[PDB]
Design a protein around this nucleic acid. Structure first.
Lengths: 1341, 50, 79
RNA sequence: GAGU
């Protein structure tokens, strides 16, 4: 069973595994994160909440006053989406916050009842998000890209080889905070541990511990494990634990108990170790020979005189041993340093660090951080303290803390932000663990080590910074001013708030113009993930490290979707099913497998979690609701693939498509396409433009419905019911009582938008799909967006291609194409181009918009109204005048000759420049619409007044319709209510409609519902009448323009741009090309049947590019149309329902191995013939990614198309009539016309505007700029002996004014003599050198 | 890598195999970009000397 | 300079009262100065923005790469 | 976002 739209069009799905989890909402990241920013959740730390409580409540420095924060309210944004887009405004809502000033006493305790003043202050405007997940910035559609960055926490890296002919194995710990200066502990060549604070200079790490309050001996405790050394008589004993020896050649005869245990020289084995352990050894005899060379732990004083002898960390020698036993200390604490496990580390650090106490450590700290500033005691202390222990400066966040705590083996999740000293020491503990070999080195590149920052989290960040500046201002003002009289609203300015926010939104790297070439482009952009931004890398900063492809990317990022060139590796699309976890870490849903059998439960796992478990691929073959089919099965654990048995297998992939991003998922036979071309394929799909006529792709994946759904540019039914009214502008639907609210009325209204301008200048038009009186379900596709068919993505159009070489028209990926394409108007773009005419005010005099245009052809005057505005609907051309404008001139430079002629002929010069609004070069289309914004100062223009009056009556009509449509629903409902328990249709029908408020029947449910709906009329009426007023405050208001600008007119040009040679076209497989020639229909080869070809693609583009999937598409594409052929035939031949039903069903059930079984049977005759009509155009199939249609099943279908199974047909050359000697591959492939139009790519310049400083020609089509003839080109000329051409380029063509003008005149005169001058650039050079006080003179001969 | 791709583009690779190939692909394209600026610069140096 | 100072102190208040922006008329009201004078001051209020300003978000252009010299009568007209 |  299926919905009404699916019943209308099925696409045959060749999917072998059943997709258990439904595709997640693709835009969720954006929606949900932005939601978190504003989410009214008092206890929940999200956005506003978190920011406020972090600094708030702000207590006075004097201590006797305080500012408290209660709660905030978001006003409903003053400007709607449409309105902000119209005026070029940023779309936002007011934030208002309830605050309290509370005042204490000095003298009387701190009696908190002195002055209490409280109220709502305005805290600025917050840019709001659209339904689409997008944002209105300066009246343009932007998206904030997700940002990957290295998570706060601990990173333990190895510099492998690096530096040195040794190649010293040198490790390092990097400490990364969310907020604060950085810590680095690294290994010097000779193994001494150096600290870099804020990675600045290398000091001994011990100095840091000194600052931390540690004594020499305290550090040696927490680092080194002491060894107990007794002196008895003349001999020496150690308290020795059996395990300590472990792997140690003997230097003496080690007499324990009685018997010789360790031979002098014999390597101690594990036997010797357990023997002694079980014997119960405390003390062992040892030579005075052993201790010379060890180290002394504590600082043992000689008690007698008081004199120190062994110091904290001193080398032991023969004579000092005598002194110690002589001082009378029975118990000596020599050190444990064998190397091996516990090496010479902390010992060595202490020696290189001549600094001693806390204070000198703080001094050297301060002197590295601020070298040259005098070490005042409190300054040094405050520096170090504030570096790591300042709450405000230093926040690790739950993020930092959680990862930090996971690396150092802590059960505890959430930390106190500031660096606790345990943490610090633990850090060095774990580094020096790894240096012994205990820890593993971490990879920066681990997904579990990289966090993703969405909308709400970024917003919160920058908002918090606004609050920081607030604190500096606010807290400062809390102390000066007199407390009593002063109110809270005086203290608070919204400016820096809105500034920092709008900084983020507008100026940031991650906020970009949404790509709206097609719905795919938008959707893909929204979920793309960049490694750049604040706290992130740039182009040079990114090496192989992060760019390269990690195994962790599996099911999280598409490995195969990224911009080619220097952006590559940095920006990557989110894989399909993938989402962000709790901590912004990447996660993938996976199926449980309990004891061999595959359960139905899904769990989302992060990368870290993923490493643990053993996962089967989706591709693995599964026994029907039991176990795995093979005894030795295909899976991966701990990031590594191979064979496992059933019982060992813990989890499994949901479907193959979770591996790949949204873009990549749309490609049909990706399985047979090389990755290079795969990459290019996803990229091209992003640039495809919607044509006039949408065509559903012959070869889809099943994802084409989902894609469109989430794009959200299509209009979707949110209740279901029956369509009451259908308009190419309005779709109104009557809901079933099912979804009907007993509160409001049941009529749902969807106003569609036709032909609006996209950011790319592309087409955004909605077509209604269904018909009036059609019964439809919740989530049916009412109206399609641009590149969308009935539910499906209609990216481009599908043509009969023939793979063959032509007479060099298909040379190197070049394309041969039929005139029939233009005949059908396929691949014709609508481009809605925008132009703006600006009437500024100079002090030369205010410019004006009039029809008044000195020395213009009345051809150009004729199309203009009295206001000087182009007529609605007039078709014009490049150069033609649209909007008239006049500007203040000022002549009077009559060089002699001019005065003469002015006298003779008259023609009295009226001062005015030709400011009037010209159309762009070589461009021709129709004016689709015009807009007028007059500033408040100057009075209304004729044209402005009349069009603002047009818009007036527009609002009226639309609003009246609104009220009456919903009123019709209400009234209809009351009759269904009054007729159920009060049988009256005679009396009511013919009574007036508005006289039913006075009514009153049986008292229960009937009466309560009646009153619900009656109050809906009162509400609708007062609602609408102000709803009107609103548009009438907006339209009436003089429109707010930038300073200096009198008035402005926006003009929309509608160009119908026809396909031509030089336009850019591609398929989904990375095969691309330029149109070389459009051949008349006759020229193209034709079938035996007489059907002529559409496009002829070069087969030589295949083999070296290695995308073979396009061939698969071609074959399946012909058979899809072969289906359409036969069906179309039986439609023309009428026939019987039953027979059509038979053919169709046997078609769907074609695969022996198909998943999707559409047993038709139950379908009504209506639905049957309806379906047939739809598949008349060629049946749309679904090979899903990797889980697709095998070649044999394709061959099988080619029999059902009654066409050659090899998919090749013999072709007759339409020119000569000769057959081609062998058959060629023909069939339908899905083609697209790119956003790259030859129309734009054309540009040329002889003379135009030049550069200001260098006096060289400008750049770009925008300035009428010339191309740069670069040093490369120079080199070419030089290779030839071509001196004069070169000199041309250097002088007459560029900066030589006298030279270029003279040579121009010479050319007209037929001379072609050069006569060069001095290029201005060289003079630029001279003067800049002399500015540097460097004398450069050009010496005479 | 020890185990190779036994299959061909004719058959179509799967999850695992296709994934495997991406490493080399991406590496290759990043090389074509970033490793060519070295060669360009080198060339310019030659030019200037000669 | 002192007039500019007034302007911006008042700006804060007015944005908070209105819930939005100050139009020249409404602003001109509260100051009891002629709208023309206000608008003049608003324009004069613009600080020097740099000619060397990287117009290219991608370090493409130092604003200068736009500026043309309209002083130059075109070689067309010189002929 | 193009191509070499």
């Amino acid at each position: 069973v299926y919905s009404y739209t699916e019943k209308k069009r099925i696409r045959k799905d060749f999917g072998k595994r059943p997709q258990v989890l439904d595709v997640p909402y693709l835009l969720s990241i954006q929606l949900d994160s932005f939601q978190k920013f504003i989410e009214q959740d008092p206890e929940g730390q999200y956005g506003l909440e978190a920011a406020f409580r972090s600094v708030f409540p702000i207590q006075s420095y004097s201590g006797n006053s305080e500012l408290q924060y209660v709660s905030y309210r978001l006003g409903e944004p003053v400007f709607d989406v449409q309105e902000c887009q119209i005026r070029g405004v940023t779309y936002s809502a007011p934030l208002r916050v309830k605050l309290r000033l509370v005042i204490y006493e000095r003298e009387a305790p701190e009696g908190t009842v002195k002055d209490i003043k409280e109220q709502e202050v305005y805290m600025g405007e917050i840019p709001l998000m659209t339904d689409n997940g997008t944002f209105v910035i300066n009246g343009t559609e932007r998206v904030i890209v997700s940002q990957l960055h290295r998570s706060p926490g601990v990173f333990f890296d190895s510099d492998k080889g690096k530096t040195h002919s040794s190649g010293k194995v040198l490790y390092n710990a990097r400490i990364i905070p969310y907020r604060g200066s950085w810590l680095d502990f690294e290994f010097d060549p000779k193994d001494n541990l150096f600290v870099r604070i804020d990675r600045r200079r290398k000091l001994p790490a011990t100095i840091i511990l000194r600052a931390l309050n540690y004594t020499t001996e305290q550090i040696l405790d927490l680092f080194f494990e002491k060894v107990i050394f007794e002196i008895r008589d003349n001999k020496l004993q150690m308290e020795l634990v059996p395990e300590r020896l472990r792997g140690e050649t003997a230097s003496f005869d080690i007499e324990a108990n009685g018997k010789v245990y360790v031979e002098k020289g014999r390597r101690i084995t594990a036997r010797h170790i357990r023997q002694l352990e079980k014997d119960d050894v405390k003390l062992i005899e040892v030579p005075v020979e052993y201790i010379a060379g060890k180290v002394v732990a504590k600082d043992y004083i000689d008690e007698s005189t008081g004199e120190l002898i062994c110091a904290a960390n001193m080398e032991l020698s023969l004579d000092l041993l005598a002194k110690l036993s002589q001082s009378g200390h029975k118990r000596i604490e020599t050190l444990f340093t064998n190397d091996l496990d516990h090496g010479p580390y902390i010992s060595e650090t202490l020696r290189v660090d001549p600094t001693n106490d806390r204070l000198s450590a703080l001094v050297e700290i301060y002197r590295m951080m601020r070298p040259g500033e005098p070490p005042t005691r409190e300054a040094a202390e405050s520096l170090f303290e504030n570096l790591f222990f300042s709450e405000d400066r230093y926040d690790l966040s739950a993020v930092g803390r959680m990862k930090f705590n996971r690396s150092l083996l802590r059960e505890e999740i959430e930390g106190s932000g500031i660096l606790s000293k345990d943490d610090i020491i633990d850090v060095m503990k774990k580094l020096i663990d790894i240096r012994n070999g205990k820890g593993e080195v971490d990879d920066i590149d681990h997904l579990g080590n990289r966090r993703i920052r969405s909308v709400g989290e970024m917003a919160e960040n920058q908002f918090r910074v606004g609050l920081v500046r607030v604190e500096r201002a606010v807290k400062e003002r809390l102390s000066l001013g007199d407390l009593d009289t002063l109110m809270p609203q005086d203290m608070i300015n919204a400016k820096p708030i809105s500034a920092a926010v709008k900084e983020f939104f507008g100026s940031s790297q991650l906020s970009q113009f949404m790509d709206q070439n097609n719905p795919l482009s938008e959707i893909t952009h929204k979920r793309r993930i960049s490694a750049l931004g604040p706290g992130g890398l740039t182009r040079e900063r990114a090496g192989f490290e992060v760019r390269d492809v990690h195994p962790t990317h599996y099911g999280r990022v598409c490995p195969i979707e990224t911009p080619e060139g220097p952006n590559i590796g940095l920006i990557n699309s989110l894989s399909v099913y993938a989402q962000t976890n709790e901590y912004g870490f990447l996660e993938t849903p996976y199926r449980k497998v309990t004891d061999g059998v595959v359960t139905d439960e899904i769990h989302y796992l992060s990368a870290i979690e993923e490493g643990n478990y053993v996962i089967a691929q989706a591709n693995s073959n599964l026994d029907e609701e039991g176990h795995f089919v093979e005894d030795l099965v295909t899976c991966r654990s701990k990031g590594e693939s191979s064979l496992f048995s059933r019982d060992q297998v813990d989890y499994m992939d949901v479907s193959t498509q979770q591996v790949v991003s949204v873009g990549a998922s749309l490609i049909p036979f990706l399985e047979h396409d090389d990755a290079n071309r795969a990459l290019m394929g996803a990229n091209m799909q992003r640039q495809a433009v919607p044509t006039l006529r949408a065509d559903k792709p012959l070869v889809g994946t099943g994802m084409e419905r989902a894609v469109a759904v989430d794009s959200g540019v299509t209009a979707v039914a949110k209740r279901g019911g029956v369509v009451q009214y259908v308009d190419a502008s309005r779709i109104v639907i009557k809901v079933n009582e099912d979804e009907m609210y007993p509160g409001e009325a049941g009529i749902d209204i969807y106003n569609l938008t036709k032909y609006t301008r996209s950011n790319q200048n592309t087409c955004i038009n909605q077509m209604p799909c269904v018909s009036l009186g059609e019964p439809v379900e919740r989530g049916d596709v009412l109206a399609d967006g641009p590149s969308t068919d009935l539910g499906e993505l209609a990216l481009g159009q599908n043509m009969r291609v023939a793979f063959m070489p032509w007479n060099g028209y298909n040379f190197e990926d070049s394309i041969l194409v039929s005139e029939r394409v233009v005949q059908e108007d396929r691949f014709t773009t609508i481009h809605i181009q925008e132009l703006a005419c600006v009437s500024r005010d100079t002090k030369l005099g205010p410019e004006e918009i009039t029809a008044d245009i000195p020395n213009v052809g009345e051809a150009a005057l004729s199309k203009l109204d009295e206001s000087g505005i182009v007529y609605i609907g007039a078709e014009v051309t490049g150069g033609d005048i649209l909007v008239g404008k006049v500007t203040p001139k000022g002549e009077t430079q009559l060089t002699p000759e001019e005065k003469l002629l002015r006298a003779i002929f008259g023609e009295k010069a009226s001062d005015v420049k030709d400011s009037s609004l010209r159309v762009p070069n070589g461009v021709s289309g129709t004016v689709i619409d015009v807009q007028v914004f007059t500033r408040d100062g100057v009075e209304k223009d004729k044209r402005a007044l009349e069009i603002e009056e047009m818009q007036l009556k527009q609002a009226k009509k639309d609003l009246s319709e609104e009220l009456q449509i919903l009123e019709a629903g209400l009234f209809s409902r009351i009759r269904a209510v009054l007729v159920a328990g009060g049988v009256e249709a005679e009396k009511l029908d013919k009574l007036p409609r508005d006289r039913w408020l006075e009514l009153g029947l049986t008292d229960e449910e009937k009466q309560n519902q009646l009153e619900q709906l009656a109050e809906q009329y009162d509400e609708l009426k007062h609602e609408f009448e102000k709803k009107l007023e609103a548009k009438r405050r907006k339209i009436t208001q003089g429109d707010d323009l930038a300073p200096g600008v009198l008035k402005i007119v926006k003009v929309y040009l509608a160009v119908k741009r026809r396909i031509q040679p030089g336009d850019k076209m591609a398929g989904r497989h990375g095969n691309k090309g330029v149109i070389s020639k459009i051949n008349p229909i006759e020229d193209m080869p034709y079938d035996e049947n007489g059907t002529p070809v559409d496009i002829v693609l070069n087969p030589l583009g295949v083999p070296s590019r290695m995308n073979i999937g396009q061939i698969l598409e071609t074959h399946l594409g012909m058979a899809a149309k072969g289906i359409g052929d036969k069906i179309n035939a039986m439609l023309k031949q009428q026939q019987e329902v039953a027979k059509l039903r038979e053919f169709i069903q046997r078609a769907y059930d074609l695969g022996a191995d198909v998943r999707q079984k559409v047993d038709l049977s139950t379908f009504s005759d209506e639905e049957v013939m309806r379906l047939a009509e739809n598949l008349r155009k060629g049946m749309p199939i679904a090979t899903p990614v990797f889980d697709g249609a095998k070649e044999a099943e394709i061959k099988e279908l080619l029999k059902l198309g009654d066409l050659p199974t090899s998919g090749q047909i013999r072709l007759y050359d339409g020119r000569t009539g000769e057959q081609f000697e062998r058959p060629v591959t023909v069939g339908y492939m899905y083609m697209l016309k790119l956003n790259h139009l030859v129309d734009d790519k054309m540009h040329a310049r002889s003379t135009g505007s030049y550069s200001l400083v260098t006096q060289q020609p400008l750049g770009g089509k925008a300035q009428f700029g010339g191309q740069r003839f670069g040093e490369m080109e120079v080199w070419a000329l030089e290779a030839y002996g071509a001196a004069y051409t070169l000199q041309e380029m250097l002088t007459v063509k560029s900066d030589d004014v006298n030279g270029r003008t003279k040579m121009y005149k010479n050319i007209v005169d037929g001379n072609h003599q050069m006569e060069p001058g001095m290029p201005e650039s060289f003079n630029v050079l001279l003067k800049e050198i002399r500015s540097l006080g460097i004398n450069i003179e050009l010496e005479d001969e | 890598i020890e185990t190779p791709i036994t299959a061909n583009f004719r058959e179509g690779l799967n999850v695992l195999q296709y994934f495997i190939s991406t490493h080399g692909a991406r590496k290759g394209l990043a090389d074509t970009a970033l490793k060519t600026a070295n060669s360009g610069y080198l060339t310019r140096r030659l030019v200037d000397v000669a | 300079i002192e007039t500019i100072n007034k302007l911006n102190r008042i700006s804060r208040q007015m944005l908070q009262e209105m819930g939005r922006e100050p139009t020249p008329e409404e602003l001109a009201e509260r100051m009891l100065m002629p709208e023309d004078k206000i608008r003049k001051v608003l324009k004069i209020a613009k600080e020097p923005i740099s000619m060397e300003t990287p117009i290219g978000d991608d370090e493409d252009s130092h604003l200068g790469d736009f500026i043309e010299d309209t002083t130059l009568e075109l070689p067309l007209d010189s002929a």
